[PDB]
Write a protein that binds this ligand. Structure first.
Ligand SMILES: CC(C)(CO)[C@@H](O)C(=O)[O-]
Ligand code: NA
Ligand code: NA
Length: 310
């Protein structure tokens, strides 16, 4: 069974219980998220382990047979979102450590959630999986590279350390997912049945941990960070659509790259912020809020297209 049909079905069927569990957790057991703070890199690693657990060599066919459509998506990813974050930081003159967190999100690759949103938007799913996989696999070099170029003068770099952080949090769990898939063969369908549950649980723990650990600066700047997230996410959609349109790509691919650009692996941003900016928790907040908003705006954008398709 397609993992994207498993994920959307799981969310659509239990979105209420998650909203109630988070609510009761943040109010009657705030420790649930504070205790998970030091495990944000592992929680993300679990998410990426899922991507690798479901990735098959067939998902790269469109790359090897239609390289130019995939190359456009990867270029549009790293050409739009890093620069967009930098511009929003300067035009709004954000605090230094908030701008670093916003730029950090922009320099990350596309989000793994775009595959489901493209599936829900009825775009080119094969393209969505390809661009996200390519951008993710080359992010150990591009994400720290672009990140220091756009925010170098704002803080220390440790670009080499961030590369290894992405290798351990992204490449290694993906590789583990691939070999676990090879070892178990068909028995992996039962492990992927629990992937929607495990992934969502990890996603909410990461968000609540970052939020709860930075509630002082969220009170005074949280609304400003959300606004930046909405604009960053929205501008990515707009430019991702006009990028696919102006290059002459079909409508299904225009929806794919629209979702691909605007949506980010904001969990990686939060994990990198926790590992390389631990003494400045606010650096991780843009990734936490982005992780929330882009799934809201993504599903809403998919719903709009789903309605116009009739
Ligand atoms: C938080 C997350 C896992 C889903 O929104 C995001 O980092 C992504 O799409 O990869
Ligand atoms: Na994708
Ligand atoms: Na993106």
């Amino acid at each position: 069974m397609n993992i994207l049909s498993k994920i959307s079905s799981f969310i659509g069927k239990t979105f209420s219980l998650w909203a109630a569990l988070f609510a009761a957790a943040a109010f009657f057991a705030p420790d649930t998220f504070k205790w998970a703070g030091p495990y944000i890199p592992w929680l993300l690693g679990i998410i990426m382990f899922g991507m690798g657990l479901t990735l098959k060599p067939s998902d790269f066919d469109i790359l090897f047979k239609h390289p130019k459509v995939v190359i456009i998506g990867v270029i549009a990813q790293f050409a739009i979102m890093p620069a967009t974050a930098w511009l929003l930081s300067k035009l709004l003159n954000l605090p230094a450590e908030i701008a670093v967190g916003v730029i950090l999100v922009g320099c990350c690759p596309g989000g793994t959630a775009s595959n489901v949103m493209t599936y829900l938007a009825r775009g080119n799913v094969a393209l969505s999986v390809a661009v996200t996989s390519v951008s993710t696999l080359i992010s150990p070099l591009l994400t720290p590279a672009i990140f220091l170029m756009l925010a170098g003068e704002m803080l220390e770099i440790q670009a080499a350390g961030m590369l290894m952080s992405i290798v351990k949090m992204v490449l290694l769990p993906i590789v583990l997912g691939l070999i676990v898939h090879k070892v178990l063969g068909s028995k992996t369908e039962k492990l992927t049945d629990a992937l929607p549950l495990v992934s969502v649980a990890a996603i909410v723990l990461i968000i609540g941990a970052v939020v709860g650990a930075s509630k002082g600066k969220i009170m005074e700047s949280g609304l400003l960070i959300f606004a930046v997230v909405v604009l960053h996410n929205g501008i990515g959609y707009l430019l991702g659509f006009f990028a696919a349109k102006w290059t002459g790509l079909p409508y299904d691919a225009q929806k794919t790259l629209t979702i691909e650009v605007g949506m980010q692996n904001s969990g990686l941003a939060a994990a990198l912020a926790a590992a390389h900016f631990a003494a400045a928790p606010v650096v991780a907040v843009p990734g936490a809020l982005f992780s929330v908003w882009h799934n809201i705006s993504g599903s809403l954008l998919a719903t709009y297209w789903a309605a116009k398709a009739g």
